[PDB]
Amino acid sequence: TLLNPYFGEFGGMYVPQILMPALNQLEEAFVRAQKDPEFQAQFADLLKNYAGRPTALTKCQNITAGTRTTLYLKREDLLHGGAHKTNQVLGQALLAKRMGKSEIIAETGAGQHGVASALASALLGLKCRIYMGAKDVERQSPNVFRMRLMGAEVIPVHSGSATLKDACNEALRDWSGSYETAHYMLGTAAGPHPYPTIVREFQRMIGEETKAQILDKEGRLPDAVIACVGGGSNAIGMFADFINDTSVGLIGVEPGGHGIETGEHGAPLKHGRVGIYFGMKAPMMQTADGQIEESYSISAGLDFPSVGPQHAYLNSIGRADYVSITDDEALEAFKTLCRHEGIIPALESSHALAHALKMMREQPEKEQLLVVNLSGRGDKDIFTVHDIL
Amino acid sequence: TLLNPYFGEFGGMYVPQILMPALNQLEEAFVRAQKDPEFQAQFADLLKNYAGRPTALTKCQNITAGTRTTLYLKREDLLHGGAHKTNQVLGQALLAKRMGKSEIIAETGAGQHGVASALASALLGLKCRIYMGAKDVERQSPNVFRMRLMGAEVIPVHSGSATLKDACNEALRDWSGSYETAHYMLGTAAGPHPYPTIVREFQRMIGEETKAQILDKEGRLPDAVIACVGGGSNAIGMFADFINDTSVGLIGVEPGGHGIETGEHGAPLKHGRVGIYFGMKAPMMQTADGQIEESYSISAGLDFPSVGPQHAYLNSIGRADYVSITDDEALEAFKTLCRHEGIIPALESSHALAHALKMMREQPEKEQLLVVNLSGRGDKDIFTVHDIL
Amino acid sequence: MERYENLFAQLNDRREGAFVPFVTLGDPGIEQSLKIIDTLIDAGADALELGVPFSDPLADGPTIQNANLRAFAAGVTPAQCFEMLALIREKHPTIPIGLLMYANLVFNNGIDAFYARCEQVGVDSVLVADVPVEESAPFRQAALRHNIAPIFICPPNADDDLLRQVASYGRGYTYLLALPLHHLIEKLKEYHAAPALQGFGISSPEQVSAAVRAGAAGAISGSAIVKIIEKNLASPKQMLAELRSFVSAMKAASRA
Amino acid sequence: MERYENLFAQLNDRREGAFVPFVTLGDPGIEQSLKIIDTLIDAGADALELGVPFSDPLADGPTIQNANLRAFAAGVTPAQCFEMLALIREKHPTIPIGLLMYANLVFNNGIDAFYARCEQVGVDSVLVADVPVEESAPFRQAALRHNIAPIFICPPNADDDLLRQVASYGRGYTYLLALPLHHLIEKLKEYHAAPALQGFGISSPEQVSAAVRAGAAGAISGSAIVKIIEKNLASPKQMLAELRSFVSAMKAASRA
């Protein structure tokens, strides 16, 4: 391998022997790609011209009133696609193109990844099949249509629990055979190496911008940068360029669900033990005899039963801290952003925000510079917050 | 009056005598405002930092294949709010603030304006009441919630046909009495002066950017800039800075509806005669004895039965040409943008695009530089295109 | 134009202030309306203010707005309104008839052709509810040429430059609607405005003697008459019998 | 480890190639499974390859995937699997038993403690379906220390550096799955790999004599046995009677 598959003890390539030439060619190609000026500029031009980067950094005006907290939001909700999924998916279809591949395989639960693979493949003339679990397909009718529309082929999984877990496997089986024509487009900084390092280098510009934008605006590095942790790309996208700025904290929010004490939650990194699944050694949600179980969260795009290897590792050397937020703490931060700043945040990112609101309400005279990663808009969620409310 | 209420013969202040001091104070304030550096910079900072401006200018890659047409899209669909309504609404709430006003009155049909007044008022701490027609409120359940959420008071009109027409009147009656505390936030470049000149100066940056962006990219002014014409702000926003570049065409698309020959259409400027309504003298949809009728279009946000005074006037001195697009011509351009470039455009803006697709299909060897104003994203429309399809 | 000047002369010489009912032509039916106006008149109405049905009344409140809808549903058109106005004039030569209007219905057939058919059926004045004094001229010359008084609303927020303009441009009467009540009447008589008739909240006789005493030449009861018709929707004897007794009560309250 | 080496010796000295059935432990019930394995054995099975139920089989196809679900619904656990393996070993001392596994179930109680209980109930080899030769070492040392053969899959896309590694690290047999069929068998015997057993598409006797003739030491029938059990879901006499006749047909096809 050209690069290290391990972030401390976490990570690896724990895949069937047959997939290994695919992963090793993808590593070799990504190392070339990151070294080629041509690749960087084409990638940049799509981000800038098709997607809308730099995204904005908003200073919150009215949510921190009569506290000493300064909130900024990184506005990945104003990205083409209204969810940060767009910056890695462009960069990986460019890579498939640079590898001579003609198809894209992908899997989904909520829809946002499937839709973001479909919108990148339409844009670059690649054939695209999305694997989605029947439970998920039924629930995610608005996103199925949006995918079909853009020309993506949707195959309905409904084996195992018919969830993302199951969708993730079938897509790899397909990759075993298709791997020299097709490319599997993995949703997050998780799974077999090198998808942990690729999905970070293609979300890394979030950090790069938040930094120069806070430097332009405030003149000093932020104190903590909060971010939720579905499987880790948005979070590791924000953290990446701040990791060597020891003065800057990095808090990652995890789905507390109905409550840590209730089990229906998606908090593997702090309350679930290490295991081997989806080609990596990293913390996960499993029974006492190794059978992996489904996690849970109000945010569909936050319930996935493990976490990125490098997130599991930054927790171990104490460089980042991971905390939790329950469903009702997410709802309240949702209504508060709407009614106060006039931004409808995605329920996923409300978890990162609820945590920064708690930090300022609990210690009101602490002067502290915060930056939340607003990582998707909430249009998708106005029906669900309206089934609760 | 400090400014001219007339664009040739079109326009005026044809309002009850009681509203006139309100309009004359609003003119005096807007003239001050546009002259004050402080106002410009605060306005700019919101556009840049809260909304995401400049928006992108995308060179289309795959829709003009094997033709000599070059399509660019101005990406007002990547604006906070995913619809150009946002740049005038910020600028007019800043004006209310600069006038010492504390409330915002507004009216709506489809939702997009009501939502955009609510998100600006939440952001600036103004009380906000939206008047919306019951027919419209029932149909527009997803937008009602999004407004309520952000703290806007919604009053359901259901008198007259219970449409925008009716909503527009009740909101003014309220303004007659509230006008020294409240400010009426009129949806488009239409109605009594000065709302035609204000709503253009606050959408004018669309033109200003499209120009410098095409100059940066292509090195020469566009050949025609297409744009739909619901009531005229998006269109007049694009046209404004090109109007004195006689070489540049300006085509505005109007709702052909089910067909010009079928009456259920919203094409007042080319197939409906002049009249006096909503405080202006401009073309409109009325019966043979002056009773104004409802127009029609697949796009809710394109059916309004008149047009801006200055659009009626640029048609008369032959400076701009206005054309039509039927509902099925809008649908086909919708599916084509999705499946080809991977952008879900709003049904409103698909009318502007269908027209530029027709222009290139009809004369394939003509080399011509086009710019369509993509003016809203289509998330709102994926259920309606899915009731048809 | 003239019949107003005859009315105010007569009332002055007998210590009387005018009382004027408003009602919508065609409400709740054509037949109905003509009986309702002949009852208002014989009950004591000194002049009439009629409304023509129009789509959105930017200058009118909810009662008149659905009153227009009741006349629309009756199958009243512009044409049936001029036919009605002509027979009202045929049974009643002396009474002033004025019209509330909206500028699209005047403009729709040419401003001059509308003032032409007004003069030809006997209309004395026209108030066009949404044409402010500074958008007046085409409507104002055209009324004068066919000797129809242009009525203007003088509003509560009336600056002095307005007060000069209204007094210079209206005829018939000034429609009255900061500034002390009495102070407006004073300034208008100074500026030589036509008879200021108070129209704001005239619904109980106490206010008619109030308006008369203040120097207003009389009072226009807008919504009240319409409401009695609404209450009595399909109560026809009570519809007219209440109307009769109301107009004569209002009228009684102005002869001092 | 050893029992394999005894099997391949015996078969060689009597001109025979091994035939090995796969089946999932606990399918479609515990009781059922033990009767099914005693029938495979007496029908002619030279060795057994068993599957343990795991959640998502990243290395297995749909048949085995819902075969695992049938055993899950039976209320089979890890604990009931080791209990089953011990009694299978009690009635049958000589036959090799190997296990298909996924790395989370090995790792879950410590890699060494899993190889410890394997050795203690009589398991001869373990193939862990998703641990590639380059993530082998903890699993490989641990198997060797409790004298359990680590089985590796040698795949179609096998580069030469792999072929060296697999031959150096597996024991028991090589699981066979660009490169001419015969050419792989040659290179493995050159590199001194353990007996290459063909597992790709063995379902009709013609292929068993094909594999045997090619130099493969025998063949593993994966999905076929499972499918006969699926077809015969609740057809119990036909379930076993078809299984009996299939294994003996397959087996017959290897003694030349």
Ligand SMILES: *Cc1c(COP(=O)(O)O)cnc(C)c1O
């Ligand atoms: C898909 C989703 C995520 C969850 O995963 P990450 O890997 O953390 O990025 C986060 N935010 C939004 C808004 C999403 O749609």
Ligand SMILES: *Cc1c(COP(=O)(O)O)cnc(C)c1O
């Ligand atoms: C509200 C709407 C319009 C219609 O009116 P304009 O005045 O032309 O701007 C246009 N585009 C979109 C996408 C809208 O939502």
Ligand SMILES: [Cs+]
């Ligand atoms: Cs941007």
Ligand SMILES: [Cs+]
């Ligand atoms: Cs998680």
Ligand SMILES: [Cs+]
């Ligand atoms: Cs931007």
Ligand SMILES: [Cs+]
């Ligand atoms: Cs229109």
